[PDB]
Structure 1
Amino acid sequence: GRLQSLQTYVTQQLIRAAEIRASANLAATKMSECVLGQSKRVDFCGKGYHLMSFPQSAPHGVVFLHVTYVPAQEKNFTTAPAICHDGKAHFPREGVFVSN
């Protein structure tokens, strides 16, 4: 009975160690891709367009402070994909053709 009671505890510790190792691999990936660089992955490091991150220690863990850029004040505009000029179709190199 005592050997079975020990074996159950060791099996549950093995399962919990696998889960904790998966979380630690995710944390290492987050640190490498967001603290040591800039992430283009959507919602990987903070909601919005990710700017940077800061790591902080914690009891049995890590805490990331994600600095992100969020657009705030919106406005309607009348848009068009291209513009005719002397029989030529002009397309924007970057940005949006708008009109007020």
Structure 2
Amino acid sequence: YENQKLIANQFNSAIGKIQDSLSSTPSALGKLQDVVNHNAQALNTLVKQLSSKFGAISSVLNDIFSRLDPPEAEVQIDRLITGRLQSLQTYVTQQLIRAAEIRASANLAATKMSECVLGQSKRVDFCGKGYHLMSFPQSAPHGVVFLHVT
């Protein structure tokens, strides 16, 4: 109450410089960028693995039957099916690992929405570097971004 004008102006100037910091360089949003690049690269290696021979004569399915007879094409096509079936199990397993990483961070954001936003957390170095005052949640693509006032 004895320094209301200085407090209000210093918070007002602090929010001015936060626009430039998120746009100064491309490494500010690297945490959310790593989410979308991990999924886009995982899909690309799955589609590109369709063209691998896996020890068979060719990676095209129709040309095996159109040139090679049906008496022994079963062992020729089992070498290609087992390779493609293994590639799906590799993809579906790595999504299960990554979902546990997000769930350990979707519960940290669900927690920080409760102490930092709806009160003051007395846990030191949890809602900011110093003595915590408040917080403001802001949405983001596939994530959330907090603005701790400290």
Q: Please give the TM-score of this superposition, normalised by the length of structure 1.
A: 0.67
Q: Which residue of 1 aligns with 2:102?
A: 20
Question: What do residues 35-76 of structure 1 show as CA deviations (whole Å, max 9, x unaligned)?
Answer: 0111100010010100000000000100000001xxxxxxxx
Which of 81, 87, 107 is the equivalent residue of 1:5? 87
Unaligned runs of 5+ in 1: 69-100
Note if 1:47 corresponds to 2:129. Answer: yes
Letter in 2 for 1:52: M
Secondary structure of the 2:134 match is strand
Superposition map of 1:13-92 within 5 A = 13-68=95-150
Higher strand share: 1
Tell me the C-alpha RMSD between the 2 structures: 0.5
The size of the alignment, in residue pairs, is 68
Choose 1 or 2 for highest CA Rg: 2
Distance (Å, rounded) in 2 between the aligned partners of 1:28 and 1:60? 14
Q: Please give the TM-score of this superposition, normalised by the length of structure 2.
A: 0.45
Q: CA deviation at 1:34?
A: 0.6
Distance (Å, rounded) in 2 between the aligned partners of 1:37 and 1:49? 13
Letter in 2 for 1:51: L
Higher helix share: 2
Unaligned runs of 5+ in 2: 1-82
Distance (Å, rounded) in 2 between the aligned partners of 1:9 and 1:47? 39
Distance (Å, rounded) in 2 between the aligned partners of 1:39 and 1:54? 14
